[PDB]
Design an enzyme around this catalytic site. Structure first.
Site, PDB file in Angstrom:
ATOM      1  N   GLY A 186     -60.113  28.508 -64.900  1.00  0.00           N
ATOM      2  CA  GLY A 186     -60.548  28.219 -66.260  1.00  0.00           C
ATOM      3  C   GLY A 186     -61.902  28.835 -66.559  1.00  0.00           C
ATOM      4  O   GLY A 186     -62.617  29.324 -65.692  1.00  0.00           O
ATOM      5  N   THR A 187     -62.237  28.801 -67.852  1.00  0.00           N
ATOM      6  CA  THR A 187     -63.509  29.319 -68.332  1.00  0.00           C
ATOM      7  C   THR A 187     -64.529  28.190 -68.369  1.00  0.00           C
ATOM      8  O   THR A 187     -64.281  27.139 -68.966  1.00  0.00           O
ATOM      9  CB  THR A 187     -63.368  29.937 -69.724  1.00  0.00           C
ATOM     10  OG1 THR A 187     -62.295  30.887 -69.727  1.00  0.00           O
ATOM     11  CG2 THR A 187     -64.660  30.642 -70.124  1.00  0.00           C
ATOM     12  N   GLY A 188     -65.674  28.414 -67.729  1.00  0.00           N
ATOM     13  CA  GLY A 188     -66.751  27.453 -67.713  1.00  0.00           C
ATOM     14  C   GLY A 188     -67.846  27.806 -68.702  1.00  0.00           C
ATOM     15  O   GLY A 188     -67.685  28.640 -69.595  1.00  0.00           O
ATOM     16  N   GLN A 189     -68.990  27.143 -68.526  1.00  0.00           N
ATOM     17  CA  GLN A 189     -70.122  27.379 -69.413  1.00  0.00           C
ATOM     18  C   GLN A 189     -70.587  28.827 -69.352  1.00  0.00           C
ATOM     19  O   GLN A 189     -71.104  29.353 -70.345  1.00  0.00           O
ATOM     20  CB  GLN A 189     -71.269  26.433 -69.049  1.00  0.00           C
ATOM     21  CG  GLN A 189     -72.541  26.621 -69.873  1.00  0.00           C
ATOM     22  CD  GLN A 189     -73.667  25.700 -69.425  1.00  0.00           C
ATOM     23  OE1 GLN A 189     -73.471  24.822 -68.583  1.00  0.00           O
ATOM     24  NE2 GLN A 189     -74.856  25.903 -69.984  1.00  0.00           N
TER      25      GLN A 189
ATOM     26  N   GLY B  50     -68.654  31.614 -68.061  1.00  0.00           N
ATOM     27  CA  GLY B  50     -67.601  32.604 -67.963  1.00  0.00           C
ATOM     28  C   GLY B  50     -66.430  32.127 -67.129  1.00  0.00           C
ATOM     29  O   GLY B  50     -66.412  31.016 -66.593  1.00  0.00           O
TER      30      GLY B  50
ATOM     31  N   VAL C 223     -63.727  31.657 -64.167  1.00  0.00           N
ATOM     32  CA  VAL C 223     -63.822  31.432 -62.730  1.00  0.00           C
ATOM     33  C   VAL C 223     -62.418  31.500 -62.150  1.00  0.00           C
ATOM     34  O   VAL C 223     -61.455  31.037 -62.773  1.00  0.00           O
ATOM     35  CB  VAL C 223     -64.482  30.078 -62.394  1.00  0.00           C
ATOM     36  CG1 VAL C 223     -64.692  29.951 -60.892  1.00  0.00           C
ATOM     37  CG2 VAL C 223     -65.804  29.925 -63.135  1.00  0.00           C
TER      38      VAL C 223
ATOM     39  N   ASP D 170     -80.660  20.958 -66.160  1.00  0.00           N
ATOM     40  CA  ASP D 170     -79.464  20.563 -66.895  1.00  0.00           C
ATOM     41  C   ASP D 170     -78.548  19.763 -65.974  1.00  0.00           C
ATOM     42  O   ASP D 170     -77.338  20.005 -65.907  1.00  0.00           O
ATOM     43  CB  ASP D 170     -78.744  21.786 -67.459  1.00  0.00           C
ATOM     44  CG  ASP D 170     -77.659  21.411 -68.450  1.00  0.00           C
ATOM     45  OD1 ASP D 170     -77.731  20.297 -69.011  1.00  0.00           O
ATOM     46  OD2 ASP D 170     -76.731  22.219 -68.661  1.00  0.00           O
TER      47      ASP D 170
ATOM     48  N   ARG E  85     -71.022  17.335 -65.693  1.00  0.00           N
ATOM     49  CA  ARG E  85     -70.277  18.561 -65.952  1.00  0.00           C
ATOM     50  C   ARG E  85     -70.735  19.715 -65.072  1.00  0.00           C
ATOM     51  O   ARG E  85     -70.038  20.733 -65.006  1.00  0.00           O
ATOM     52  CB  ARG E  85     -70.396  18.949 -67.429  1.00  0.00           C
ATOM     53  CG  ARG E  85     -71.817  19.156 -67.883  1.00  0.00           C
ATOM     54  CD  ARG E  85     -71.922  19.695 -69.297  1.00  0.00           C
ATOM     55  NE  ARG E  85     -73.324  19.935 -69.614  1.00  0.00           N
ATOM     56  CZ  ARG E  85     -74.199  18.974 -69.874  1.00  0.00           C
ATOM     57  NH1 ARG E  85     -73.829  17.706 -69.941  1.00  0.00           N
ATOM     58  NH2 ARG E  85     -75.478  19.289 -70.058  1.00  0.00           N
ATOM     59  N   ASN E  86     -71.871  19.579 -64.391  1.00  0.00           N
ATOM     60  CA  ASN E  86     -72.382  20.614 -63.506  1.00  0.00           C
ATOM     61  C   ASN E  86     -72.208  20.271 -62.035  1.00  0.00           C
ATOM     62  O   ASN E  86     -72.619  21.059 -61.177  1.00  0.00           O
ATOM     63  CB  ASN E  86     -73.863  20.872 -63.802  1.00  0.00           C
ATOM     64  CG  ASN E  86     -74.085  21.429 -65.194  1.00  0.00           C
ATOM     65  OD1 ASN E  86     -73.260  22.186 -65.710  1.00  0.00           O
ATOM     66  ND2 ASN E  86     -75.198  21.053 -65.813  1.00  0.00           N
TER      67      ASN E  86
ATOM     68  N   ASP F 260     -75.054  25.118 -60.532  1.00  0.00           N
ATOM     69  CA  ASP F 260     -75.601  25.634 -61.788  1.00  0.00           C
ATOM     70  C   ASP F 260     -77.035  25.163 -62.012  1.00  0.00           C
ATOM     71  O   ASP F 260     -77.450  24.885 -63.139  1.00  0.00           O
ATOM     72  CB  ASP F 260     -74.713  25.249 -62.970  1.00  0.00           C
ATOM     73  CG  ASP F 260     -73.499  26.139 -63.088  1.00  0.00           C
ATOM     74  OD1 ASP F 260     -73.606  27.328 -62.726  1.00  0.00           O
ATOM     75  OD2 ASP F 260     -72.441  25.655 -63.540  1.00  0.00           O
TER      76      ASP F 260
HETATM   77  N1  LIG Z   1     -66.982  26.540 -57.188  1.00  0.00           N
HETATM   78  C1  LIG Z   1     -65.911  26.023 -58.036  1.00  0.00           C
HETATM   79  N2  LIG Z   1     -64.846  25.448 -57.496  1.00  0.00           N
HETATM   80  C2  LIG Z   1     -63.889  24.990 -58.314  1.00  0.00           C
HETATM   81  N3  LIG Z   1     -63.840  25.026 -59.657  1.00  0.00           N
HETATM   82  C3  LIG Z   1     -64.925  25.609 -60.160  1.00  0.00           C
HETATM   83  C4  LIG Z   1     -66.011  26.138 -59.411  1.00  0.00           C
HETATM   84  C5  LIG Z   1     -66.912  26.655 -60.436  1.00  0.00           C
HETATM   85  C6  LIG Z   1     -68.275  27.343 -60.242  1.00  0.00           C
HETATM   86  C7  LIG Z   1     -68.352  28.696 -59.958  1.00  0.00           C
HETATM   87  C8  LIG Z   1     -69.602  29.296 -59.801  1.00  0.00           C
HETATM   88  C9  LIG Z   1     -70.770  28.524 -59.938  1.00  0.00           C
HETATM   89  C10 LIG Z   1     -72.155  29.162 -59.768  1.00  0.00           C
HETATM   90  O1  LIG Z   1     -72.244  30.344 -59.791  1.00  0.00           O
HETATM   91  N4  LIG Z   1     -73.305  28.264 -59.590  1.00  0.00           N
HETATM   92  C11 LIG Z   1     -74.682  28.738 -59.415  1.00  0.00           C
HETATM   93  C12 LIG Z   1     -74.982  30.094 -59.300  1.00  0.00           C
HETATM   94  C13 LIG Z   1     -76.274  30.492 -59.139  1.00  0.00           C
HETATM   95  C14 LIG Z   1     -76.587  31.993 -59.013  1.00  0.00           C
HETATM   96  C15 LIG Z   1     -77.640  32.872 -59.737  1.00  0.00           C
HETATM   97  C16 LIG Z   1     -77.707  32.745 -58.246  1.00  0.00           C
HETATM   98  C17 LIG Z   1     -77.274  29.571 -59.082  1.00  0.00           C
HETATM   99  C18 LIG Z   1     -76.975  28.213 -59.193  1.00  0.00           C
HETATM  100  N5  LIG Z   1     -75.682  27.818 -59.357  1.00  0.00           N
HETATM  101  C19 LIG Z   1     -70.670  27.155 -60.234  1.00  0.00           C
HETATM  102  C20 LIG Z   1     -69.416  26.575 -60.388  1.00  0.00           C
HETATM  103  N6  LIG Z   1     -66.358  26.417 -61.620  1.00  0.00           N
HETATM  104  N7  LIG Z   1     -65.216  25.821 -61.404  1.00  0.00           N
HETATM  105  C21 LIG Z   1     -64.369  25.420 -62.529  1.00  0.00           C
HETATM  106  C22 LIG Z   1     -64.656  26.293 -63.754  1.00  0.00           C
HETATM  107  C23 LIG Z   1     -63.859  25.830 -65.009  1.00  0.00           C
HETATM  108  C24 LIG Z   1     -64.069  24.322 -65.296  1.00  0.00           C
HETATM  109  N8  LIG Z   1     -63.923  23.556 -64.056  1.00  0.00           N
HETATM  110  C25 LIG Z   1     -63.026  22.385 -63.953  1.00  0.00           C
HETATM  111  O2  LIG Z   1     -62.948  21.804 -62.920  1.00  0.00           O
HETATM  112  C26 LIG Z   1     -62.186  21.895 -65.149  1.00  0.00           C
HETATM  113  C27 LIG Z   1     -60.667  22.061 -64.981  1.00  0.00           C
HETATM  114  C28 LIG Z   1     -61.303  20.668 -64.880  1.00  0.00           C
HETATM  115  C29 LIG Z   1     -64.691  23.969 -62.884  1.00  0.00           C
END
Ligand SMILES: Nc1ncnc2c1c(-c1ccc(C(=O)Nc3cc(C4CC4)ccn3)cc1)nn2[C@@H]1CCCN(C(=O)C2CC2)C1
Length: 265
Positions: free
Chosen positions: A15-18, A20, A22, A127, A131-132, A145
């Site tokens: 899915g798309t997060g805050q 972009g 993933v 933040d 949600r984070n 995040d």
């Molecule tokens: N790791 C996951 N595993 C399973 N799902 C995941 C993830 C993530 C994810 C991917 C990357 C990051 C990151 O880059 N953090 C960072 C980077 C930096 C970099 C500058 C140095 C610094 C600090 N934090 C953080 C979260 N997103 N997501 C879904 C997305 C869509 C919505 N989601 C849901 O669950 C809804 C469907 C219920 C979560």
């Protein structure tokens, strides 16, 4: 460190997060990872890329581990530890009837530990919210995040009155002066605890951001969740002191949490 996408596999869309889209995949075969493609036009890239090298040296069991990045193409890829149960906000809602208060307090200890490591590195989240936070396959919660909002171009996400500013997690000094500190992350953690014990209810659901800001400024505080003991509530309530210096540090906070866990035995 830089990663050659040659050593990555795209296996599923999450899915798309805050920040972009993933996808789930494998890094170097043995690493379950989540690859984020930074939405183009959203970030101050050069500043963000250079800072990613700083956030790479942050390591902690309760921090979503960062493995590397792909920056010599656009969109930037971010390779992170795979958290199988997704966002903490949605994990809480789908499994509302599967949580005993012992598991909820655990989820608060997980986040507080991660935030206590960030406190000791003088690193701010800016933040912190459910949600984070993400949950892995073993139910462990981890923060992610952190510091990402420093490089957002949209002024709505950054200004105190922006339509996208997280007013409902903000301390009075962040709303009126934009003074971010570990104490503002503590206020936010208090709200996060309330999210957890509320099983994912929107804090101040029926208040406009402005209505929230003014009420907060004049003493309104979230109601005690039904599943929270007065001792748990006392902890999240201490995060919401009007005076930042009157708020306990994550270290002082983690100890209190462990005291409650011991008393729940
Ligand atoms: N790791 C996951 N595993 C399973 N799902 C995941 C993830 C993530 C994810 C991917 C990357 C990051 C990151 O880059 N953090 C960072 C980077 C930096 C970099 C500058 C140095 C610094 C600090 N934090 C953080 C979260 N997103 N997501 C879904 C997305 C869509 C919505 N989601 C849901 O669950 C809804 C469907 C219920 C979560």
């Amino acid at each position: 460190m830089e990663i050659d996408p040659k050593d990555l596999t795209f296996l599923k869309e999450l899915g798309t997060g805050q920040f972009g889209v993933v996808k789930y995949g494998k890094w170097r075969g043995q690493y379950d990872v989540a690859i984020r493609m930074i939405r183009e036009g959203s970030m101050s890239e050069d500043e963000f890329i250079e800072e990613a090298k700083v956030m790479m040296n942050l390591s902690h069991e309760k921090l979503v581990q960062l493995y590397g990045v792909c920056t010599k193409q656009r969109p930037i890829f971010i390779i992170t530890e795979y958290m199988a149960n997704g966002c903490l906000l949605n994990y809480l809602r789908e499994m509302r009837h599967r949580f005993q208060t012992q598991q909820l307090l655990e989820m608060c200890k997980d986040v507080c530990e991660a935030m206590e490591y960030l406190e000791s590195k003088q690193f701010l989240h800016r933040d912190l919210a459910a949600r984070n936070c993400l949950v892995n396959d073993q139910g462990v919660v981890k923060v992610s995040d952190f510091g990402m909002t420093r490089y957002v171009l949209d002024d709505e996400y950054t200004s105190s009155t922006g339509s996208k500013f997280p007013v409902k997690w903000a301390s009075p000094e962040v709303l009126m002066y934009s003074k971010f500190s570990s104490k503002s992350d503590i206020w936010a953690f208090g709200v996060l605890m309330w999210e957890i014990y509320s099983l994912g209810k929107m804090p101040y659901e029926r208040f406009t951001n402005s209505e929230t800001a003014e009420h907060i400024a004049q003493g309104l505080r979230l109601p005690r969740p039904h599943l929270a003991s007065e001792r748990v509530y006392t902890i999240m309530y201490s995060c919401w002191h009007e005076k930042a210096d009157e708020r306990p540090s994550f270290k002082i906070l983690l100890s209190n949490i462990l005291d409650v866990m011991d008393e729940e035995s």
